[PDB]
Structure formats: C-alpha cells, structure tokens
C-alpha cells in the first residue's frame, strides 16, 4: 500500500538547524506533488508549501516562504523540510501529504491530499484561514452540519476538500472535489458547496466520528491551499 514515511520526533534548542524527511513508497514518486503541513500544539492545520519531485518545482505559502526550505531527492524517493535556525515557535507536528490527482491522465486537475504521513513532532525549547465553527456536538443519530466560509479567491472559484483527524494521528481525506467520497468513507458523510461557502453533513453521528474536521480549498491569490480553523466534533452520551 502507498505510504509516506516520515522521520522520527525531534527535540532541539532555539538556533539549531533541522532537516526532516518524507519518503514516498509504492507509487511513482516523481509524478505527484507533495505538500508540507504544520500543526502547532492544540491548533489547526496550516499549508506550508509543496514540491513536485520530478523537477523540484517548489511552491510556498507566503506565510512560510523564506522561513523554511522544501527540497527533494528523486533517487531516494524522499522530500525534505529544513530550517537553518529554529525558533521555539517552530514547535509543532509536521505532516507531509501526497496530492492525489493524476496530472498525466488527461482529466482536469483538482488539488486534494489523499495519502498522509504519520507526522513528525518537533519540540524547540530551552527549559488567513477559512472560517469554521470551532465546535460541533450531538448525541448518536444527531444530524450535524459543519460550515466553511471563504471568499471568491478560494471556495468561490475552487473545489473544497474535507479532512478528518483523530487526535495524535494523521488527517484522513473525507470528501474531495466538493462532494466526492473516497472508498472507505461511509455514506453518512456528504459535502456541498455554494457560492463562497461549503458544508460537511453527517446524516447521523456515530461515536467513532469524534474528531477534528478541517475544510480546505486552493486559493488562487495565494497559490496554495488554505485550511479552515477546524471543528472539534463531540459525540455526547
């Protein structure tokens, strides 16, 4: 099975350099974009940038460009994220993720992150987002909708994806291209988009649905993905 293998946890002091890695296995490594995503402790997902390993084409979020370096070694099927000088504020979990669209297949290309690495935690110490409600809750069976509000440059002109993240684990693609479900995602999950807003509906909650949910869309002005702040879903009981 396809996987992205990330390097182990790091504990560093402010000022030190660090390079972390993400090795792609069981697919054609040169032919898919790989994204890096930051999650500060207790916070949401942030798009850092992405690289196309075939030619090392790198596209950064303006929030991260000049602060980190993304690179790739085709021969070892590995992508990297590197800092020359860490700050305490760099403490976070870093995920790599494959963009699952097939660029060569002749169909219009949509951005979505289909396979995620397990994350690498980095602890450094010396001793714009889409709008989502921060929480949702219901008893088992409760119909719950989670909203995502954006603007013309993202949701208005681009497709929306949804990711589910159970604490301590990697996000999982739930809905892509507004309303399409990957195999394995149950039919109680559905997505819709209208104007500059999008919605994830859970027709009736199950206990295993307790998780954080993130919407995401490409922003044409920023030339990268933008995540919503996340909705923590509690199932009451």
Residue numbers in the entry: 1 to 127, 143 to 252
Provide text from the study.
A type I hypersensitivity response is initiated when allergen-specific IgE bound to high-affinity IgE receptors (FcεRI) on the surface of effector cells, such as mast cells and basophils, are cross-linked by allergen. The major birch pollen allergen, Bet v 1, is one of the most potent, and therefore also the most studied, tree allergens in Europe 19. We present four novel Bet v 1-specific IgE, for one of which we solve the structure, all with their genetic origin in the IGHV5 germline gene, and demonstrate that they target two non-overlapping epitopes on the surface of Bet v 1, thereby fulfilling the basic criteria for FcεRI cross-linkage.
The crystal structure of the M0418 scFv was determined to 1.3Å resolution. The structures of the two independent molecules of the asymmetric unit were similar and were superposed with an RMSD value of 0.56Å over 232 Cα atoms. The most significant difference between the two molecules was disorder of a stretch of residues from CDRH3 of molecule B (residues 110-112.3), while that from molecule A was completely modelled. In molecule A, CDRH3 extends ˜8Å above the surface of the scFv. The order/disorder observed for CDRH3 in the two molecules can be attributed to differences in crystal packing. Thus, in the absence of stabilizing contacts, CDRH3 is mobile. Two glycine residues immediately precede the CDRH3 loop, at positions 108 and 109, and presumably contribute to its flexibility. Nevertheless, the structure of the unbound IgE scFv M0418 demonstrates that a human allergen-specific antigen binding site may display a protruding CDRH3, similar to human antibodies of other isotypes 60–62. The more narrowly defined epitope of IgE-derived clones M0418 and B14 (residues I56 to K65) encompasses the loop connecting β-strands 3 and 4 of Bet v 1, and belongs to a conformationally flexible region of the allergen 49. Notably, the critical importance of residue F62 in this interaction explains the inability of M0418 to bind Bet v 1.0112, an isoform that carries a single modification (F62L) in relation to Bet v 1.0101.
